[PDB]
Amino acid sequence: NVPPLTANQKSLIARLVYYQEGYEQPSEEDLKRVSDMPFRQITEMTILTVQLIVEFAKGLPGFSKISQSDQITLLKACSSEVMMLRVARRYDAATDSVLFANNQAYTRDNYRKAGMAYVIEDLLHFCRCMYSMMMDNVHYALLTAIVIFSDRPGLEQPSLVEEIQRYYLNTLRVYILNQNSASPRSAVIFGKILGILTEIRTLGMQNSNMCISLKLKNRKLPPFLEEIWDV
Amino acid sequence: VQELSIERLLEMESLVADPSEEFQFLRVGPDSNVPPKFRAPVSSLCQIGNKQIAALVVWARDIPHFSQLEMEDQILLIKGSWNELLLFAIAWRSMEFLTRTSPPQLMCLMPGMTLHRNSALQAGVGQIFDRVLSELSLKMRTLRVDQAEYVALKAIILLNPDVKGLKNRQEVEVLREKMFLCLDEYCRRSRSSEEGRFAALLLRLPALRSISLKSFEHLFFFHLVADTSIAGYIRDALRNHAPPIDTN
Numbered sequence: 352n353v354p355p356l357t358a359n360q361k362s363l364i365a366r367l368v369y370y371q372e373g374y375e376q377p378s379e380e381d382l383k384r385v386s387d388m389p390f391r392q393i394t395e396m397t398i399l400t401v402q403l404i405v406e407f408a409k410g411l412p413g414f415s416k417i418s419q420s421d422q423i424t425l426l427k428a429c430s431s432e433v434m435m436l437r438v439a440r441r442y443d444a445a446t447d448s449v450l451f452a453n454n455q456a457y458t459r460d461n462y463r464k465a466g467m468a469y470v471i472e473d474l475l476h477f478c479r480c481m482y483s484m485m486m487d488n489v490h491y492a493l494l495t496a497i498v499i500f501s502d503r504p505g506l507e508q509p510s511l512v513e514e515i516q517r518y519y520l521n522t523l524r525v526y527i528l529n530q531n532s533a534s535p536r537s538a539v540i541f542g543k544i545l546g547i548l549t550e551i552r553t554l555g556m557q558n559s560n561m562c563i564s565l566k567l568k569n570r571k572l573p574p575f576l577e578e579i580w581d582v
Numbered sequence: 583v584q585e586l587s588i589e590r591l592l593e594m595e596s597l598v599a600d601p602s603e604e605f606q607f608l609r610v611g612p613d614s615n616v617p618p619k620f621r622a623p624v625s626s627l628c629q630i631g632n633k634q635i636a637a638l639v640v641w642a643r644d645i646p647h648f649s650q651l652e653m654e655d656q657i658l659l660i661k662g663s664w665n666e667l668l669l670f671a672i673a674w675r676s677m678e679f680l681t682r683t684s685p686p687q688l689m690c691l692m693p694g695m696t697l698h699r700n701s702a703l704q705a706g707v708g709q710i711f712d713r714v715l716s717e718l719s720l721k722m723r724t725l726r727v728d729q730a731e732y733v734a735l736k737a738i739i740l741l742n743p744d745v746k747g748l749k750n751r752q753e754v755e756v757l758r759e760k761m762f763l764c765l766d767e768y769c770r771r772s773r774s775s776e777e778g779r780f781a782a783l784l785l786r787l788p789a790l791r792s793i794s795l796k797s798f799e800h801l802f803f804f805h806l807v808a809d810t811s812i813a814g815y816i817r818d819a820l821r822n823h824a825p826p827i828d829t830n
């Protein structure tokens with residue numbers, strides 16, 4: 352009838368959802384531990400959240416199989432794209448805003464004060480578009496893994512990273528199939544999720560274009576972000 | 583959306599656009615950083631792209647249920663995807679000229695001409711030249727992508743419900759979702775042996791997006807795009823351009 356999820360697939364899903372909740376919290380109480388101040392809140396919150404993405408990625412099955420420089424290539428390229436997903440995941444429809452518990456840095460006003468107000472509407476549009484997909488934590492977690500293992504320029508072993516990604520892709524396909532009783536609409540749900548990969552390429556580019564704009568205006572990023580976003 | 587099918591998109595591909603009423607989407611501006619010794623060749627390439635955009639507008643117009651969309655939505659969809667479709671067609675055409683330890687050297691901008699990698703190096707666009715031929719052309723040949731999957735992906739590229747400014751997003755969703763059904767069914771009935779093919783095909787789309795964004799940087803850097811007038815060109819092209827002719 353409907354191909355069931357193998358024990359490796361069910362274990363992978365439970366593993367990713369478990370550590371997604373653990374790396375969800377931009378905490379360790381580092382909010383307390385860690386017009387210039389508005390831009391410094393954004394850069395400090397981003398550093399903390401990027402470090403959660405790196406630890407989430409380093410714990411993904413397959414991340415240890417690839418070369419070290421291939422790991423740096425993936426983490427440098429997926430960092431901004433996964434940041435769009437994490438912020439979009441906290442969209443609240445009732446207020447049409449992003450609620451990040453510590454709702455200060457990623458609010459409209461802090462972005463307006465820091466001079467990056469022109470970016471808010473492009474972000475919220477993506478938030479609305481992603482919110483309407485109604486992804487559960489399995490859809491969202493598997494998508495995050497698929498973003499990390501995407502084919503990036505400069506990979507020494509692109510075929511290897513593709514084989515790793517295919518394992519998460521196939522897990523996502525079978526999960527949707529079992530959740531929809533092999534309905535033809537499984538392709539629609541699956542295809543729309545893969546469509547997000549296309550759209551976050553634009554957002555990551557727009558993020559790269561702001562990093563370029565900051566250098567021309569001589570406003571500098573914290574060195575952790577400068578190295579990961581390839582100044 | 584019942585008329586929208588891979589079979590109809592296949593017979594649309596044979597239709598040839600009539601003598602294209604020239605719309606100057608791409609042109610060499612009055613003050614352009616393109617060196618004078620290369621403005622004429624670059625201008626000819628712009629005139630070639632403009633004809634292909636015009637054939638693209640006429641293609642999108644006769645797509646089933648596209649013309650029933652709101653006219654403002656039709657303009658936005660073509661405005662946001664014309665570049666990716668040009669590159670996707672370039673990559674599709676360039677597969678013949680693949681090997682006709684070295685990278686691919688020829689890119690087919692149109693049936694009767696090719697771009698050599700050395701000309702891309704002199705223009706400083708070598709990296710994007712190689713990305714088109716490897717991430718798209720070579721990958722589609724390795725993937726054994728047939729014409730049915732090509733026309734389906736073109737429709738999926740065009741029918742993007744995430745385009746900012748649409749007035750009827752759900753009318754575009756219904757069209758793209760029908761294409762997902764068509765592509766998945768075609769993979770199950772004809773490519774039954776290959777697993778993960780549906781995902782493998784759609785993975786070219788984010789690669790196509792990044793390459794398209796890099797091309798826009800070069801085009802805008804050399805002041806080649808008339809961005810303030812493209813929506814207007816698309817408006818008049820949908821209304822006045824002659825319909826295609828079936829060669830049959």
Ligand SMILES: C/C=C/CC/C=C\CC/C=C/CCCCCCC(=O)OC[C@H](COP(=O)(O)OCCN)OC(=O)CCCCCCC/C=C/C/C=C/CCC
Pocket residue numbers: 608616617620623624627628630631665668669691697701702704705706707710711714797798800801804806
């Ligand atoms: C996306 C749709 C594409 C279809 C066609 C659309 C627009 C046409 C523009 C495409 C150009 C591709 C490169 C062809 C260059 C041919 C002339 C040449 O060799 O110039 C060398 C010159 C050395 O000068 P120089 O004196 O050394 O100084 C210049 C320093 N760079 O270089 C220059 O003249 C500088 C400008 C060259 C044109 C840049 C166009 C940018 C377009 C990118 C989109 C590419 C898509 C596919 C990849 C080819």
Ligand SMILES: Cc1nc(-c2ccccc2Cl)n(NC(=O)c2ccc3c(c2C)OCCO3)c1C(C)C
Pocket residue numbers: 393394397431434435438457467470471473474554557558561562576
């Ligand atoms: C330190 C820092 N942190 C971020 C960021 C913040 C939240 C989500 C994603 C990112 Cl990448 N950004 N980027 C943006 O704020 C940003 C840039 C471009 C965008 C965008 C955002 C959020 O949103 C979508 C439109 O394009 C920056 C900049 C200052 C380097």
Ligand SMILES: [Mg+2]
Pocket residue numbers: 366367370407408409410411412
């Ligand atoms: Mg993990």
